[PDB]
Symmetry: C3
Amino acid sequence: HSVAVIGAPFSQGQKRKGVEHGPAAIREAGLMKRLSSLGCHLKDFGDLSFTPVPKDDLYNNLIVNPRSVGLANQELAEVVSRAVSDGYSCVTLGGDHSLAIGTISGHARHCPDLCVVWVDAHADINTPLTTSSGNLHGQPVSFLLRELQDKVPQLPGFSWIKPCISSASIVYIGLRDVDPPEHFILKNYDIQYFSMRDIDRLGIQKVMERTFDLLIGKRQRPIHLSFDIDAFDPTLAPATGTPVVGGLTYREGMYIAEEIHNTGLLSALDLVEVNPQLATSEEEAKTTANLAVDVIASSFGQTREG
Amino acid sequence: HSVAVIGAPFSQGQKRKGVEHGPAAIREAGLMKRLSSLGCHLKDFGDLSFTPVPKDDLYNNLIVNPRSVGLANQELAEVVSRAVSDGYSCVTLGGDHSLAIGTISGHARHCPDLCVVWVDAHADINTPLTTSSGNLHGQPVSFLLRELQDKVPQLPGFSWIKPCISSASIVYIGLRDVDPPEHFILKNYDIQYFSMRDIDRLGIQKVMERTFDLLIGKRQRPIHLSFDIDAFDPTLAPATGTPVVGGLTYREGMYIAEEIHNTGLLSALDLVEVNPQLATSEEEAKTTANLAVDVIASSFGQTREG
Amino acid sequence: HSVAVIGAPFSQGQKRKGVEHGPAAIREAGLMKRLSSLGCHLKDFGDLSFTPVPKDDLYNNLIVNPRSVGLANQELAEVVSRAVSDGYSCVTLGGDHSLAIGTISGHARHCPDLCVVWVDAHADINTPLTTSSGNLHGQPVSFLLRELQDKVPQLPGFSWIKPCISSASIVYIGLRDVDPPEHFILKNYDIQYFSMRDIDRLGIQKVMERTFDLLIGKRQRPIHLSFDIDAFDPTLAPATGTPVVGGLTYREGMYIAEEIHNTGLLSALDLVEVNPQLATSEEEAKTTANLAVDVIASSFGQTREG
Ligand SMILES: CN[C@](CCCC[B-](O)(O)O)(CCN1CCCCC1)C(=O)O
Ligand SMILES: CN[C@](CCCC[B-](O)(O)O)(CCN1CCCCC1)C(=O)O
Ligand SMILES: CN[C@](CCCC[B-](O)(O)O)(CCN1CCCCC1)C(=O)O
Ligand SMILES: [Mn+2]
Ligand SMILES: [Mn+2]
Ligand SMILES: [Mn+2]
Ligand SMILES: [Mn+2]
Ligand SMILES: [Mn+2]
Ligand SMILES: [Mn+2]
């Protein structure tokens, strides 16, 4: 089993400095040794340097860094597509969540029947017409879902995207901070999600059972796990840009990752939004990075029973 | 929907200074803006000034401030009764829990078929003959329950009080610090409760289901939610007078409030025992107040899925 | 109901200084008063002084202090045997977990059909041939299980030990840090365990129900509860030698202890691995000791409903 690791020090999907240091932080927390110990053959692509775009003015006076986000994602997609085509399960370290535009595009370029498990406090499904922040890290799913495209305008730097993934092929876990237009979208397009309230009711075991029945209950499909560290409670993952109280416990996060591993179908994984600069202490920074490593390792087979 | 907000800075139901500043702390945490954002039409009564009673000596050399507690509650009951009669859902900010004598009395005046959900680490059902502290905030239920009245002595300042509620019409959630005479009372009078142990066994979803079956299983009734912030684990609500380890999680507390809102039957709510002076840091005081606001907002419709 | 308390300030089953101060820390947290208040008649044996062994050199260049651990356990077994023979439920305060060799051996002398509930982050079932640390506190179960004895070499100081119980007579609860040889042993000998993952799935109520069905489902048996404080999440029990993230919550630990009491069969209890010197603050040391007292008190009848 072979794993590719790509650092994507992405910060222009949002406004807070420091998230570009996520990949280094996760690596420093021992990611590569942990994967090796599990028996993963590794190819490290290092941390990418993305091509800058001159005069990348706001789109519609609101959407920030659109060409820079578009181009960085186009470049990322090429690296991801090549890794997956070469037989690697592809781990991308963020960086802000706008990079999932590139990792999912690149993954789908080799594996068009992929499904997505999106683990996050947020749905990240605002469009350029509904976002109240202008930050592309809160919009990436809108560019990817086929059924939404007639409601998503063409941004500069975004023309290369081919959104063929169905709204029936993504399931959210963890949701507790959803903007009203996002809620409208989830309901109107019948997109399946398990909010923190659903987890409180069902328990994480049944959440994972139902998630897989929805996505792979009829046929085996490669799985893309896009994991925003802010899915965890801020007490566990404080070093992140949009923390929301009442999140996943450590055990719940490990359980999600274990069930992902147990499918035997994990094909790519994003671990995004670790921002070491937002920690109030080096301890807070390190615990957040340690947690990120635990998620990735559990997704590739680390168990609690040995 | 119209919501009345009443500050009741009572402290004389107990001995620790500062709980009178609970209402202010909860306001400062953004309560009014939060309720407005949900669509609530608001009538703010401000913080009431209760008539003092000079030389309010101990009763039976134990009971603390009985005439003051009795009179403040008579005054509060009139304000609550008037607000309910004007069609408001009544939110009362404490202040110590002895104020529930007044809010439930005032509420029952126009809604005699009300039921009570009492969320608390404690049962608050000692009588003047069983209390070992003398503090009236640990006795309010004893004055309210019809079945107990031949066991409750007449206190100075308490003659206006009629027991309004049957023992079958209150359910406790959260109990973990119960005095032996209270346990005797709960068992002897078949009063229904879900202790922290019951929550550990059933899960909060089932606890709320059974709570409503017990109270509103046969008919719709107005609901009085009396919520003591100390129901929450002290790590979440440290600024309170009688913290007890092993409490509700943030998620459980939100779930309770959501289920209350989902009945469509919430008619009055108490949020008591926030004492900002007992915080060891201003952060501890603020987080307790923020949590109080979260409870009240969720009880009137704030959701985690937006 | 009579309870014996034995301090066993064992440290030579491992390499970190300070665990020998565990018994004092637990006593200082109010253990004896708490047990008396529940109605337990107490015999305090004090803290034992074990006979040292000169030149207690490594066995096989790896196993640390074998003669010292062997002799201390022989001496402890004598005290536990006497206390059980005199009709006391025997509480032993550690000290490192190698002391369970002595307490279970002593207990089994008069109560050979005892069963063991082993609450721990670890299985402690390495043998002298599988341990990678050499630390006997991670090996005690290997010496106790009859099915394993063809695989357990004879250590100096260990000749007195007769493998007491069957592999079908121990159930683990809480496991999350298991060495590969231990995992092999648990599987190969069909030893039943509930890892943290199993708890996440089943809930602690079902875990206790199934534990009792496995051990006492068809006959009543005296229970030996061997409780390593590291079963709890390190946020709750930081003062311990081998903390592992993702442990039991406070409520889960109380529930386990409550169920043990509810069987009416508790015959001996170990509370081990509290090391106050490993706390980073006095508060960390005290909360760990306080938790130890709560476990013991709940195991002997302290309830959360009064
Ligand atoms: C929920 N929507 C937000 C947050 C996006 C977080 C991105 B992710 O990668 O971390 O999950 C926030 C919108 N709210 C901000 C606060 C005021 C109300 C709107 C947005 O900026 O779109
Ligand atoms: C449980 N009963 C107590 C606490 C009441 C808390 C009031 B509430 O509004 O906050 O829920 C405490 C009884 N004491 C007996 C043993 C010594 C300390 C507690 C009392 O004072 O009656
Ligand atoms: C899991 N086995 C360990 C820990 C024993 C803990 C003893 B107990 O009483 O506290 O539960 C550790 C094995 N090591 C192997 C990998 C490197 C670090 C741990 C051992 O030393 O045998
Ligand atoms: Mn997020
Ligand atoms: Mn995200
Ligand atoms: Mn209380
Ligand atoms: Mn109360
Ligand atoms: Mn252990
Ligand atoms: Mn142990």
